[PDB]
Every structure is written in C-alpha cells, then in structure tokens.
C-alpha cells in the first residue's frame, strides 16, 4: 500500500484528479484498478514507463488533460479509457497495439481527423465495442474499423463522405450516430449501411440529406432519425424491408408529398413524427388519408397536417374529405 503523496488511494481507486499534474506519479499501487487522472494539465511526455506494469488497471480517466496524441505506455490490460476533452490528433497502430483488450474508448471533444489516424490502427483492437469520436475533425469514416464495434458516435464532425468499406464489415454495429455533420446523399456510398445486420439505431439528425437514404438494413433497424435536414423526397425503396422499425422521425425537413405505399413494409411502426414539413394536400396526398384511416389506433402520427393550400392549412390529413 504505497500511494503517491499528491494523490490519494483507497482500495484500488486512485484519485489523482484535479491536481495540476503535468506528469503521472511514479508510485502507483500494484493493486491499482481505476485511475482518476482527469482535470490535470497532463501531456504525452508525462506518462512514466512503469505505468505499463499496472496489470490490474481496468479503468483510466484521462479526460480534460493536455494530451496532443494517443497515449502509449498505458497499462497493458486497460478496458475502459476516457480521453475526452484532450487535444489528440495522431493515432497509430502501435499505440493501440499496446492495449489490445480495450473495450470502450472515448475520444470525444478532440482534434482527430481521418488522416490523423494510421491506416489499420485498430487491427488488433479485437475487443473494442464502443468507439466515441464525437466532436472531432473527421471529414469521413475511417477505413479500418474492428468487426467487434457495437456503438459508434460520430456526431458534430465535418463528415461529408462515407465510403462503403468503412462501414461494411461492421456486422455487430447496433448504434450509429452521425448527427451534426455535413452529409448529403452525394456523400453516401451505394450500400454503405446495407450490411449492418445488427443495426438498431441510425441517427442522421442535422445534416444535408435531400432525400431519405436507401438500402438501409431492415433486419434490426428499430429507430430512424432524419430530422433537421432538407429532404425533398422519399425514393420508392427508402423504407423497404424495414419490418422491425417502430420509430421514424423526419421532422424539420422539406417534404410536401409522399409516393404511394412507401410505408407498406413498416409492419411495426408505432411512432411516426413529421412535424414541420410543408405538406401539400393535393390529389397526390389522397392515398395518405386512406393509409392513415387504415392505420391501427396503436400507431402515433404527428405533424401530418396540411400547410398548402392555405385553404386547408393546419387540418389533419387523416380528416380531409375533399382536396385538389
């Protein structure tokens, strides 16, 4: 039981946070389990060589430090690693090779771009399940990502493109978050989402989609968020095969008309949110009125009301008799 003077130690929990450290203290107990190193001014040269030997460390909190690249020399068996609010740009295969049992990784609020990541950095990370890259400088999705991933948060980046191979192979992915990016349908590869069998949430809030994306996986897709884009259109096959989808939101978009029977595969739809769309109730909208009346009471529909013509503005599409 030897605990560094600056820090305080209690039964494997090492509290070295908020102590203006520029370096990690040398005398860490061998029975270390969780490392509280957050809220320090720690840079990459402040990690001692002996840190690697702390073989019982499973959780490390290094958020809100001064790290400018991926920390090497971390305890060989880390499982939980929180690097948010650092200045990390570079990430190399070698660095990640050092902690191959890593399971969840928080790089939120850093300065990583796709190029600042070595190609194939993750080839050994055969246990990574959670990868959070929220609020970085990514402009695309990195080609080499481990099959084991289950959650992938990429919100508020500068992503404008998504190659097919970046997402293909992620056959375990369940949640994919691309809110707050610069995506438009030109930026989408052919079947980028197509192979994500295990996908449960797709969240594309706050981009520049002008059309509902196609070739989505319908085996498990349960929630689908498309708000705050500029979607003009629903291609005929957009919601194809989504037999498990119970939630779909296209609020704050630019839809005025729906193709006939786009919602025909939505066997499990329960929540359909279309507030703030410029719905135009003409002879093209008549099928929708029917479909609404044929819809089970269970199902919750919101915002599906006429904006045009002014004549019938604000009236529920389910309740109209005559429009043209």
Ligand X SMILES: *[C@@H]1O[C@H](CO)[C@@H](O)[C@H](O)[C@H]1NC(C)=O
Q: At its nearest, how many Å lie between ligand X and the CB of residue 244?
A: 14
Q: Which helix (H) or strand (E) holds 300?
A: strand 300-302
Residue 198 binds ligand X, judged by CB under 6 A: yes
The alpha carbon of 184 is separated from its chain's Cα centroid by a whole number of angstroms, namely 17
Give the contacts of 250 (CB within 8 A, at least 6 positions apart). Answer: 212, 226, 227, 231, 273, 274, 277
Closest CA relative to residue 139, chosen from 163, 167, 122, 174 = 163
Measured from the CB atom, is 76 or 79 closer to ligand X? 79
**Structural contact between residues 163 and 188, judged by C-beta atoms closer than 8 angstroms:** no
Residue 126 binds ligand X, judged by CB under 6 A: no
Tell me how far apart the alpha carbons of residues 11 and 239 are, in angstroms, rounded to a whole number: 53
Measured from the CB atom, is 171 or 260 closer to ligand X? 171
Measured from the CB atom, is 172 or 307 closer to ligand X? 172
DSSP per-residue codes, 119-168: TTTTTT-TT--EEE-TTS--SB--S---TT--EEE--SS---BB-HHHHT
Residue 45 region, left (φ>0) first, then alpha (ψ -120 to 50), else beta?
alpha
Per CB under 6 A, the list member of 172, 185, 257, 307 interacting with ligand X is 172
Measured from the CB atom, is 89 or 129 closer to ligand X? 129
Residue 197 binds ligand X, judged by CB under 6 A: yes
Residue 168 binds ligand X, judged by CB under 6 A: no
Residue 244 binds ligand X, judged by CB under 6 A: no
Q: At its nearest, how many Å lie between ligand X and the CB of residue 183?
A: 25
Q: At its nearest, how many Å lie between ligand X and the CB of residue 196?
A: 9
Residue 171 binds ligand X, judged by CB under 6 A: yes
Measured from the CB atom, is 139 or 172 closer to ligand X? 172
**Structural contact between residues 137 and 112, judged by C-beta atoms closer than 8 angstroms:** yes
Q: At its nearest, how many Å lie between ligand X and the CB of residue 317?
A: 38
Look-up: residue for tokens 């097919």? Answer: 164
Q: At its nearest, how many Å lie between ligand X and the CB of residue 153?
A: 18
Measured from the CB atom, is 56 or 147 closer to ligand X? 147
Q: At its nearest, how many Å lie between ligand X and the CB of residue 222?
A: 13
Closest CA relative to residue 232, chosen from 254, 252, 251 = 254
- Enumerate residues 176-195 that contact ligand X by CB under 6 A: none
Residue 278: half-sphere exposure toward Cβ, Cα within 13 Å = 9
Measured from the CB atom, is 35 or 192 closer to ligand X? 192
Measured from the CB atom, is 198 or 237 closer to ligand X? 198
Q: At its nearest, how many Å lie between ligand X and the CB of residue 150?
A: 7
**Structural contact between residues 189 and 164, judged by C-beta atoms closer than 8 angstroms:** yes
Q: Exposed (0-12), middle (13-18) or buried (19+): which is 173, by Cβ within 10 Å?
A: buried
Task: Name the token pair of 13.
Answer: 């929990």
Q: At its nearest, how many Å lie between ligand X and the CB of residue 245?
A: 17
Q: Which parts of this chain interact with ligand X (CB under 6 A)?
A: 171-172, 197-198
């Amino acid at each position: 039981k030897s605990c560094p003077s600056v820090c305080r130690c209690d039964a494997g929990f090492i509290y070295c946070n908020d102590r203006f450290l520029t370096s990690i203290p040398t005398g860490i107990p061998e029975d270390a389990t969780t490392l509280y190193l957050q809220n320090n001014q720690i840079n990459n040269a402040g990690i001692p060589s002996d840190l690697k030997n702390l073989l019982k460390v499973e959780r490390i909190y290094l958020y809100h430090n001064s790290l400018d690249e991926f920390p090497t020399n971390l305890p060989k068996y880390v499982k939980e690693l929180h690097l948010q609010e650092n200045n990390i740009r570079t990430i190399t295969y070698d660095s990640l090779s050092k902690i191959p049992y890593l399971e969840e990784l928080h790089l939120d609020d850093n300065s990583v771009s796709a190029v600042s990541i070595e190609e194939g950095a993750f080839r050994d990370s055969n246990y990574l399940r959670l990868l959070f890259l929220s609020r970085n400088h990514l402009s695309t999705i990195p080609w080499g990502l481990p099959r084991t991933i289950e959650e992938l948060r990429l919100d508020d980046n500068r992503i404008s493109t998504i190659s097919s191979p970046s997402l293909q192979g992620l056959t375990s992915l369940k949640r994919l978050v691309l809110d707050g990016n610069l995506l438009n349908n030109h930026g989408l590869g052919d079947k980028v989402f197509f192979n994500l069998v295990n996908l449960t949430e797709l969240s594309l809030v706050r981009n520049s989609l002008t059309a509902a994306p196609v070739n989505l996986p319908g085996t498990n897709l349960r929630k689908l968020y498309l708000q705050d884009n500029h979607i003009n259109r629903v291609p005929p096959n957009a919601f194809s095969y989504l037999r498990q989808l119970y939630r779909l939101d296209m609020s704050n978009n630019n839809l005025s008309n729906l193709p006939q029977g786009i919602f025909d595969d939505l066997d499990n739809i329960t929540q359909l949110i279309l507030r703030n769309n410029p719905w135009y109730c003409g002879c093209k909208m008549k099928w929708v009125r029917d479909w609404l009346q044929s819809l089970p009471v269970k199902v919750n529909v919101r915002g599906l009301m006429c904006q045009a013509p002014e004549k019938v503005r604000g009236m529920a599409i389910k309740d109209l008799n005559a429009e043209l």
